[PDB]
Every structure is written in C-alpha cells, then in structure tokens.
Amino acid sequence: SIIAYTMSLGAENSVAYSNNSIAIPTNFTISVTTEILPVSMTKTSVDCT
Amino acid sequence: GQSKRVDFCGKGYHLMSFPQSAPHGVVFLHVTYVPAQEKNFTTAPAICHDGKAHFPREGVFVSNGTHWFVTQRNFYEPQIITTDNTFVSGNCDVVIGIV
Amino acid sequence: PPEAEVQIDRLITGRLQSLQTYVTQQLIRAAEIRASANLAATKMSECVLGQSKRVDFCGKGYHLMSFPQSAPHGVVFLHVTYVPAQEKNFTTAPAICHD
Amino acid sequence: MYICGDSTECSNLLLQYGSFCTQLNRALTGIAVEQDKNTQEVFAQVKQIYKTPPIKDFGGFNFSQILPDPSKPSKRSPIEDLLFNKVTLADAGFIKQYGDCLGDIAARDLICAQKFNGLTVLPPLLTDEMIAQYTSALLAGTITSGWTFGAGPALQIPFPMQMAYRFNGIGVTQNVLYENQKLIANQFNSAIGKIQD
Amino acid sequence: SETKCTLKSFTVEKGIYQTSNFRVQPTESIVRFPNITNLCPFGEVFNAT
Numbered sequence A: 001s002i003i004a005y006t007m008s009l010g011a012e013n014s015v016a017y018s019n020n021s022i023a024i025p026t027n028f029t030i031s032v033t034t035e036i037l038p039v040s041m042t043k044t045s046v047d048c049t
Numbered sequence B: 001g002q003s004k005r006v007d008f009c010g011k012g013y014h015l016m017s018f019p020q021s022a023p024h025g026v027v028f029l030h031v032t033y034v035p036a037q038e039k040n041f042t043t044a045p046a047i048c049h050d051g052k053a054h055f056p057r058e059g060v061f062v063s064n065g066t067h068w069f070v071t072q073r074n075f076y077e078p079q080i081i082t083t084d085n086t087f088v089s090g091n092c093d094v095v096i097g098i099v
Numbered sequence C: 001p002p003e004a005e006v007q008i009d010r011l012i013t014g015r016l017q018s019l020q021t022y023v024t025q026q027l028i029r030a031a032e033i034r035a036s037a038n039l040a041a042t043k044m045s046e047c048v049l050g051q052s053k054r055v056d057f058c059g060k061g062y063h064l065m066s067f068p069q070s071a072p073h074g075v076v077f078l079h080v081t082y083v084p085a086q087e088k089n090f091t092t093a094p095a096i097c098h099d
Numbered sequence D: 001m002y003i004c005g006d007s008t009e010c011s012n013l014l015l016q017y018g019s020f021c022t023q024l025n026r027a028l029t030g031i032a033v034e035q036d037k038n039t040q041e042v043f044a045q046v047k048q049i050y051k052t053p054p055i056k057d058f059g060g061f062n063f064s065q066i067l068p069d070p071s072k073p074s075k076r077s078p079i080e081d082l083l084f085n086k087v088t089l090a091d092a093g094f095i096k097q098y099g100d101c102l103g104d105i106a107a108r109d110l111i112c113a114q115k116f117n118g119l120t121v122l123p124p125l126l127t128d129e130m131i132a133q134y135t136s137a138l139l140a141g142t143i144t145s146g147w148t149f150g151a152g153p154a155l156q157i158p159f160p161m162q163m164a165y166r167f168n169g170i171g172v173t174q175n176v177l178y179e180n181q182k183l184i185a186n187q188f189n190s191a192i193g194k195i196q197d
Numbered sequence E: 001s002e003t004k005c006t007l008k009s010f011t012v013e014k015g016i017y018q019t020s021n022f023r024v025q026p027t028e029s030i031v032r033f034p035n036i037t038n039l040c041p042f043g044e045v046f047n048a049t
C-alpha cells in the first residue's frame, strides 16, 4: 500500500571532539567514481514552408 | 593535471582521472585517495625541551600510551622526534598545552 | 456562435500568449538561479569543506575558513580571512655573497 | 482557469489548444523540479548529520552566533534567525482554504486572486527546519573535524590545531598562531559579533 | 541563387548554407468521382405543383 513518511536527511553521527585528541588514518583505499556530463544536443534545421 | 579543489574531481583527495566518451557527452573516471582505518592519539601543539619550544616541521606531535612521535598528517607513520623534524621558536611559557 | 466564437477565440489566443510569455520568463530566470545555485554549491565544497587558494573566491584576503548560514531561498556564507595589517619598509637583496 | 474562467463554451473551444497547455506545464514542472535539486546540491553534500558536541573549549573561539540556539522553537543560530526575519515572503504557509478566500472578500488578498485564476504556488521539498539541520551538521563537522569530514571519515582535531593548519595554508608558520592564540580568538569573536549587527 | 535571396545579398561568404529542400512538381492531375449517371431531381424540387 501507499505510505507517507517524513524523509530522513542522513545518518546520525558525531565527532569525538576533545582539546588534546586527534585521529590519524593508519590505512587507505583507492576509490574510483564515475561522473557523467552532457556535451552536446541534437543539431536541427527547419523548413517553415 | 591534479586539482586541489574539494569535490571538484570526485570525493576524496584527487589523484587522477581518465575520460571515456559516450553519445552526446563525456564520462570521467575519477581516481581518489580515501583515508580508511584510523586511530585515536593524544596530541600537543609543541614540545618543551630545554625551555625552548619545538614545533613540528611537517606533521603533528602524536602520542601513544607512553611515547611521543611526530607524524605526517594524512597517514600514521611515527618518527622519532629529533631536531630535524622540528623547528624552534619562542619558549615554554607561551604555547598553551605545550608538553 | 457565428460571431461569438470569433470574439472568444481572440481572447483565448491572447491569454495563451500571456501564459507563454510567463513561462518563457520563468525558464530564463530559472537558468540564472541554477547558475547561482551551482556557484553556491561550489563554494560550499571549496570554502566550507576545504581551504581555497583562489583569489577573492572565498572573500577578500587570504582564506582561512567559512561557515554557511541558511536564509529563505538561499545561503549566506561567512568567510573568515587573514589580512596583513601594520607593515614596515626594509632593504632587500636576492642573495647573500659569503665566501 | 486562467483562460476560460469556467465558461463552458470557452472550455470546449479551448480543446483545440490542449497540446499547448500541456507544453506550458511540462516547462513549469521542469523548473519546479530543478528548484529542489538546487537546494540539495547546495545543502545536502554531507549525509552524515554530525552533532555539535556539548560545548567544550575551542581555545577561546566563540561559535555561538553560528551554532543553533536551543532555546528557539526552530533551531536556528542567532544569525540565521536574523536572516529569516529580514527576507519577507509572499505568504506564511501553503494552505489557504476556499472558505478563507470566500469569507474575507474585503481583504482583496492577492494570493486568493492568484488562486482563483489558476495560478498555484507549490511548497519546497526541504523545509526550513531540514535546511537548518543540514547547516548545523556542516558546522559541527567544520568545527570538530575541519576539512576532513568532507573528504571521507571525520577525524577529530583540537580546534586550535585546525587553525594552525589554516595558517600554514595561507602561508605563515604555525608558531604565529599559538603565540598569538588569544589575540586571534578575540579578533575572530569580534568579527562575528559585528556581522550580526 | 536561393542562398543569395535568403540572405538578401548579391555576395555570399565562404561556408554552408541551407537551401530549402529537394522538391518535385506534379506533372498531371487526377480527378476521381463515383460514376453517377442520373441527374438530380431539380424538376421535382423546384417545379412542384
């Protein structure tokens, strides 16, 4: 059935902020993402007669 | 080239990209570096040595349960803190939280 | 009808013309808003989620950081920058001749 | 409604132009959709909603005019609340009932005049409250994990150290910040106060 | 010449111009009506007692 709901804006999270504490990454990964962009559209002409 | 613009060439730190063609457009494959596993370390702005204040040259002062090391910001790789990895300016009575 | 339909058609054509004028203007305005929105999105990534080195992109002076604030139909950015102040005249030279 | 005004004879004549009316709304729909996309492109870049920590020191840096004010009915910062009370909108809700337009004839309310002629204003998908949550998440991130939360995981950094990196970034040695930390925090705090005024 | 008329000019610059469309003309006409041979009852309609 059709349901309605308040949408979620994102996950709940936090940062463990403290005046004398830091986080440093110890490992990493390589990620490759894909970005798709239009460059051109259809070229047209019209015979009005 | 390599862009330093955030999220311009994809999420993460940009390394490189490769174009691919498509009908009426271009598709880019963006290769980026993403920090992964991480740890909680103690820090301090500077080290107090003989009364002089030592600042990290390229990195942060980081400490495990018993020892202080200096590391590059984006990857944990602890070095012995030496006079080569630091610069000296000012003294122990000025920097807040100097250890 | 033989006459009424002429008078009605004059009004129908005229009202459709008014509506087309409206839609065209809204499409043009929408394009301008999109461009503004794309700029705002770019700044969010480059001024808020990172530090830009682009001159006058994130305000005047050297950029340090920024904080977004919302507003009806838009975004307001507070750009925090470093500005050189008191200054002095000094003598200079490209290099020093030693031994 | 705009063209015929419920005249039956007009409505039938207008059938021959139905393809034009359809085209006008396809264009308007396209605009309306883009307006929600624009909002998301600007404010929904980070899908982790980071909470502002209980306030701990930031080394003298006061962010209370940019962070949400918990005493308000809508969690806007003092500056945002000011911005919202300066831009004036055409209406104050999206529900206008027939019975309200019918009763209050004397007002000659332009909103009713627009509705009776078929001109409709639609609500945004993201409400002001949701935008405020996104803005607050970005500030919490910037303040507690400056510029790392936007790259991947959010790694905590003491606020004064984040500033040290910012200073190296513009081109001065970080010792300048620590030696002048109190001054810098005061100049910063003053500038924010001036903006609200 | 078609390009010259379109551009209202006796000089045409280097490039490509569109010039209407390829058209052909009809050469003959066809007339088709059902082969009705009777004349309509004009007499009965207009010459009635």
Ligand SMILES: *[C@@H]1O[C@H](CO)[C@@H](O[C@@H]2O[C@H](CO)[C@@H](O)[C@H](O)[C@H]2NC(C)=O)[C@H](O)[C@H]1NC(C)=O
Binding pocket: B064, B065, B066, B067
């Ligand atoms: C902090 O790091 C140091 C350096 O790795 C650790 O000390 C070393 O521990 C190994 C045994 O695992 C010994 O063989 C070395 O001689 C130690 N080095 C020094 C200088 O004493 C130290 O244990 C780590 N501390 C904590 C709490 O994990």
Ligand SMILES: *[C@@H]1O[C@H](CO)[C@@H](O[C@@H]2O[C@H](CO)[C@@H](O)[C@H](O)[C@H]2NC(C)=O)[C@H](O)[C@H]1NC(C)=O
Binding pocket: D055, D061, D062, D063, D064, D193
């Ligand atoms: C940030 O600055 C504001 C002032 O702009 C501080 O709020 C004031 O706090 C005093 C009590 O210490 C009250 O008497 C004032 O009436 C408050 N002013 C306003 C406008 O509310 C606020 O406490 C400071 N916050 C931090 C973290 O430093």
Ligand SMILES: *[C@@H]1O[C@H](CO)[C@@H](O[C@@H]2O[C@H](CO)[C@@H](O)[C@H](O)[C@H]2NC(C)=O)[C@H](O)[C@H]1NC(C)=O
Binding pocket: C086, D183, D186, D187
């Ligand atoms: C650098 O500039 C700052 C101001 O931008 C100076 O700080 C002020 O100094 C006066 C001294 O009479 C104090 O009364 C003010 O309260 C200080 N302002 C702040 C925000 O703290 C600073 O002294 C200057 N330093 C140098 C070396 O010229």
Ligand SMILES: *[C@@H]1O[C@H](CO)[C@@H](O)[C@H](O)[C@H]1NC(C)=O
Binding pocket: A016, A023, B038, B039, B040
């Ligand atoms: C750092 O400490 C906090 C304490 O609340 C903990 O929740 C977090 O997971 C720890 N982070 C890491 C990388 O160990």
Ligand SMILES: *[C@@H]1O[C@H](CO)[C@@H](O)[C@H](O)[C@H]1NC(C)=O
Binding pocket: B048, B049, B050, B051, B092
């Ligand atoms: C060690 O730290 C104390 C402050 O806790 C300071 O008074 C003392 O001079 C420091 N000792 C050094 C640099 O040898």
Ligand SMILES: *[C@@H]1O[C@H](CO)[C@@H](O)[C@H](O)[C@H]1NC(C)=O
Binding pocket: A019, A020, B044, B096, B097
């Ligand atoms: C952090 O805050 C505590 C008080 O909770 C204080 O004693 C300590 O010196 C502070 N450390 C730094 C680096 O500011």
Ligand SMILES: *[C@@H]1O[C@H](CO)[C@@H](O)[C@H](O)[C@H]1NC(C)=O
Binding pocket: C087, C088, C089
């Ligand atoms: C540098 O010298 C010029 C000489 O004409 C003077 O006008 C200027 O004010 C001086 N600048 C500073 C920073 O002292």
Ligand SMILES: *[C@@H]1O[C@H](CO)[C@@H](O)[C@H](O)[C@H]1NC(C)=O
Binding pocket: C097, C098, C099
């Ligand atoms: C000092 O400068 C002069 C030129 O003015 C040069 O001839 C001389 O060798 C220099 N002396 C040094 C480097 O000792």
Ligand SMILES: *[C@@H]1O[C@H](CO)[C@@H](O)[C@H](O)[C@H]1NC(C)=O
Binding pocket: E042, E043, E046, E047
């Ligand atoms: C009508 O009748 C007259 C004779 O009175 C005749 O001359 C005429 O042609 C008739 N008209 C038609 C259409 O048959």
